[PDB]
Amino acid sequence: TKVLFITANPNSAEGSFGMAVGEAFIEAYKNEHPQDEVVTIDLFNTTVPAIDADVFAAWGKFAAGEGFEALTEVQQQKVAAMNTNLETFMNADRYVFVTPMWNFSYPPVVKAYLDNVAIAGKTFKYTENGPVGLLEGKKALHIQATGGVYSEGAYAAVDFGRNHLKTVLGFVGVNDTEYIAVEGMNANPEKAQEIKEAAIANARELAKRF
Amino acid sequence: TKVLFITANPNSAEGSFGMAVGEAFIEAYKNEHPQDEVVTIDLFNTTVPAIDADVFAAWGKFAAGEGFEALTEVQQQKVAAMNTNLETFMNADRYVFVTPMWNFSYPPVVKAYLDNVAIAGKTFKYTENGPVGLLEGKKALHIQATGGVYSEGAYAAVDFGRNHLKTVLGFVGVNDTEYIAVEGMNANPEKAQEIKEAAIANARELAKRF
Ligand SMILES: Nc1c(S(=O)(=O)O)cc(Nc2ccc(Nc3nc(Cl)nc(Nc4ccccc4S(=O)(=O)O)n3)c(S(=O)(=O)O)c2)c2c1C(=O)c1ccccc1C2=O
Ligand SMILES: Nc1c(S(=O)(=O)O)cc(Nc2ccc(Nc3nc(Cl)nc(Nc4ccccc4S(=O)(=O)O)n3)c(S(=O)(=O)O)c2)c2c1C(=O)c1ccccc1C2=O
Ligand SMILES: Cc1cc2nc3c(=O)[nH]c(=O)nc-3n(C[C@H](O)[C@H](O)[C@H](O)COP(=O)(O)O)c2cc1C
Ligand SMILES: Cc1cc2nc3c(=O)[nH]c(=O)nc-3n(C[C@H](O)[C@H](O)[C@H](O)COP(=O)(O)O)c2cc1C
């Protein structure tokens, strides 16, 4: 069983609630499954090429029957890095996302990463009725840290980071998805110590059954 | 009146549906208000620094009473571009966003850009019970091209590009928002030109009253 620990939190001075819950999960999981391989993909220190003019130019050449050698050096580096992210994602059995909420969504790279892992012929295929996912036997956890409370109630409609990630996962075939919110620390800093520990305990219990 | 034509498509108007509708709008607007200054901001050719460890360290240095000289060169370059993006956005009266739907949302640079224009003490401020916007007297349009139909009905909930952009715009204080969808060209290919032209007509009529 291969697990991808995919994180999108910059290594700043302040610390990270999401990272603390994520590391607690991964350590608890590794204790339960000493034989499973865990791979850390840090999105702030991984090449995650955005779909741009070069990527469209590479795609236009593939459509025109030309190969990889017809691409420029920059184009070659871009699609090789895209394919390596894609292959890694396809090869894993389990995905664990760790994300902060910025501006009611996730950091930009998370979108860049999803645009890398959602590829025709690889994670979805076209049908008469539109694209359908190809992935089977997958399972995913999303750990999101938020300043306010969005897990339940009215504000759930504006938790765009969570809701989009679940949709893309669902699109490619991964609809067995767990969710752990580390929420309300900026709303109630007085109980941020207890919110973190409650989420850590919730993570350690899930690792025993993930 | 100053208008920001903010585009996030690596293809030009000859190559994209939304950009064709976008160009139809901005040109029809310009004839109607020849005095108005229109600035095109192509996000695929603008320095839009992602919030990272460098940016957080820089912010920590400004808060600590230290000045611009306290930052490394890379920190200086990132915060200088972030401030130029912020200044340009703040001083504008109108914003037109042109966006394609990729993977049920917008391209990552759009989020990166939103992270540049939603800053504390500039476009929003803190209160006892949460952040609230500062921008007054602004109006926005979002033009989005989509393969399927997300305008109304069941799939409106998975239209994350449209919904998140409106939320951030609404959060910073830009309440007056317009929306045009160039939709269903992939779902009904033999009806694609008539969709484009119907959307172009919708854009031209809006320009007279935007
Ligand atoms: N930097 C921050 C920070 S901080 O951690 O660095 O202080 C925090 C932070 N969020 C942030 C969220 C909530 C609160 N405080 C706060 N307090 C109470 Cl008593 N109630 C609520 N309500 C509240 C507000 C928003 C959402 C949900 C809820 S809730 O009702 O479900 O609790 N919020 C506070 S506080 O600093 O004013 O206390 C900051 C943000 C930001 C942003 O930079 C930012 C940029 C663009 C858009 C949004 C934000 C943003 O929200
Ligand atoms: N490259 C594409 C393209 S392409 O045509 O430009 O090659 C197109 C494209 N979208 C895409 C959207 C719709 C259809 N076709 C298609 N046809 C019918 Cl008869 N019905 C529907 N229904 C449909 C499908 C999706 C959403 C909504 C509806 S709708 O019924 O409410 O209109 N779709 C087709 S088709 O190629 O199979 O014909 C591709 C996508 C992609 C993606 O790369 C992609 C990546 C990640 C996630 C999603 C996508 C994606 O959706
Ligand atoms: C740039 C930035 C944007 C933020 N935006 C939001 C927001 O829109 N809503 C919210 O509730 N909290 C927001 N926050 C607060 C963080 O989500 C919160 O501190 C969270 O714990 C960060 O995750 P981490 O602790 O794992 O780093 C923001 C923080 C930063 C630095
Ligand atoms: C990389 C990529 C991802 C896409 N993802 C989606 C999607 O999730 N849903 C959808 O309906 N259409 C999707 N499409 C189809 C486009 O939304 C549609 O072709 C649209 O016209 C593109 O906008 P543009 O013509 O302005 O570039 C995708 C197209 C590309 C190239």
Cα B125 versus chain centre, distance: 21
Q: Measure the CA–CA gap between A140 and A151, rounded to whole angstroms.
A: 17
Measured at the CA of B114, the angle between CA A9 and CA B121, to 5 degrees, comes to: 90
Q: Which residues of A4-29 are buried (b: 16+ CB within 10 A; e: fewer)?
A: bbbbbbbebeeebbbbbbbbbbbebb
Distance CA B51, CA B57 (A): 11
Nearest to B122 by CA among B152, B157, B84: B84
Half-sphere exposure of B74 (CA within 13 A, CB side): 8
CA distance A60 to A49: 17
Which technique was the structure solved with, according to the deposited record? Answer: X-ray
C-alpha of residue B26 to centroid of ligand 4, in Å: 22
Alpha-carbon distances of B7 from A39, A97, B25, B141, rounded to whole Å: 36, 30, 13, 12
Helix axes A108-117, B108-117, angle to 10 degrees: 180
Q: Does A11 touch chain B (CB under 8 A)?
A: yes
**Cβ contacts of A34-38, under 8 Å, gap ≥ 24:** A36/A1, A36/A2, A36/A3, A37/A1, A37/A2, A37/A3, A38/A2, A38/A3, A38/A5
Element (H, E) at A31: helix A17-32
Name the binding residues of B for Ca(2+): 202
Residue B35 Cβ contacting ligand 4 at under 6 Å: no
Structural domain of A21: 1-210
Rounded distance between C-alpha atoms, residue A16 and residue A199, angstroms = 13
Interface size between A and B, measured as CB pairs under 8 A: 91
Query: How many folded domains does chain A comprise?
Result: 1
For residue A120, what is the DSSP state? Answer: B
Locate B42 and state its tokens. Answer: 């192509």
Atom in ligand 4 nearest the alpha carbon of residue B100: 23
CA–CA distance, B93 with B91 (Å, rounded to integer)? 7
Question: According to the 3-state scheme, what is the secondary structure of B152-173?
Answer: CCHHHHHCHHHHHHHHHHHHHC
Residues B53 and A10: beta-carbon distance below 8 Å: yes
- The answer to whether B103 contacts A112, with C-beta atoms less than 8 Å apart, is no
Q: Which residue of B has its CA nearest to A155?
A: B167
The SS3 of residue A130 is coil
Instruction: Say if CB A84 and CB A49 are below 8 A apart.
Output: no
Nearest-atom number in ligand 4 for the CA of B104 is: 8
| Nearest protein CA to atom 13 of ligand 4, as residue | B147
Ligand 2 within 6 A of B11 CB? no
CA distance B61 to chain A (A): 12
B78 CB near a chain A CB, below 8 Å?
no
How far is it, in rounded angstroms, from Cα B95 to Cα A89? 37
Rounded CA separation B108/B114 (Å): 10
Q: How many angstroms separate the alpha carbon of residue A142 from the centre of ligand 4? A: 26
Tell me how far apart the alpha carbons of residues A33 and A15 are, in angstroms, rounded to a whole number.
28
Query: Which CA distances in Å does B24 have to B40, B106, B201?
Result: 14, 21, 9
**d(Cα A50, Cα A54) in Å, to the nearest integer?**
10
Q: In Å, how far are A67, A72, A170, A177 from A137, measured between CA atoms? A: 32, 37, 12, 12
The CATH number of the domain where A4 resides is what? Answer: 3.40.50.360
Helix (H) or strand (E) holding B145: strand B139-146
Question: How far does residue A146's CA lie from ligand 3's centre (Å)?
Answer: 5
Task: Locate the chain A residue with the closest alpha carbon to B49.
Answer: A108
Is ligand 1 within 6 A of the CB of residue B126? yes
- How far apart are the C-alpha atoms of B103 and A164, rounded to whole Å? 9
Would you call B152 exposed, middle or buried from its count of C-beta atoms within 10 A (0-12, 13-18, 19+)?
A: exposed
